[PDB]
């Protein structure tokens, strides 16, 4: 349309909504797949730890929930005639919870796979596992904080 609001301006917004959930779901997938292969190899012989050792896939799933919130929040601010200012803050919120939630979902996958294979040879590692795991989780929450803060400047 005009100079402030062109027609390619909701491409950034649409890409951002897609990016927020595809990159967090790729990181939460890698976290689930390495933790689930650590669980389904762990509890072959130690089946009574099946509810303690599942916290890496719950915690990797919280990255997916964080990604989902950003996508819903910036799809509420999408529109045909939107300014290009709000297009790039929806793309900044997109790839700031995106490429941070995939790296945080990767690090939950490697730490959670090392943890659930380690907190069964010695159960004293279960407190040390999750405190490392929280650190690899809130890096996705730090990505989420930027997105919320940056989506707070739309219109």
């Amino acid at each position: 349309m005009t100079e402030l609001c062109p027609v390619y301006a909701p491409f950034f917004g649409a890409i951002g909504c897609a990016s927020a959930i595809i990159f967090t779901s790729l990181g939460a997938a890698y976290g689930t797949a390495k933790s689930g292969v650590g669980i389904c190899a762990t509890c072959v012989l130690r089946p009574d730890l099946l509810f303690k050792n599942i916290v890496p896939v719950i915690m990797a799933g919280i990255i997916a929930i964080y990604g989902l919130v950003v996508s819903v929040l910036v799809c509420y601010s999408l529109g045909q005639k939107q300014a290009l200012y709000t297009g790039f803050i929806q793309l900044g919120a997109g790839l700031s919870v995106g490429l941070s939630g995939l790296a945080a979902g990767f690090a939950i996958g490697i730490v959670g796979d090392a943890g659930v294979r380690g907190s069964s040879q010695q159960p004293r590692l279960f407190v040390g596992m999750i405190l490392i795991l929280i650190f690899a989780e809130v890096l996705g929450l730090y990505g989420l904080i930027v997105a919320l803060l940056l989506n707070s400047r739309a219109t």
């Binding site: 790039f88 793309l91 900044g92 919120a93 997109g94 790839l95 700031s96 995106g98 490429l99 941070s100 730090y142 990505g143 930027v146 940056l150």
Partner: peptide, 8 residues
């Protein structure tokens, strides 16, 4: 793309 790739 400098803010989102900063925290990224």
């Amino acid at each position: 793309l400098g803010i989102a790739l900063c925290v990224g």
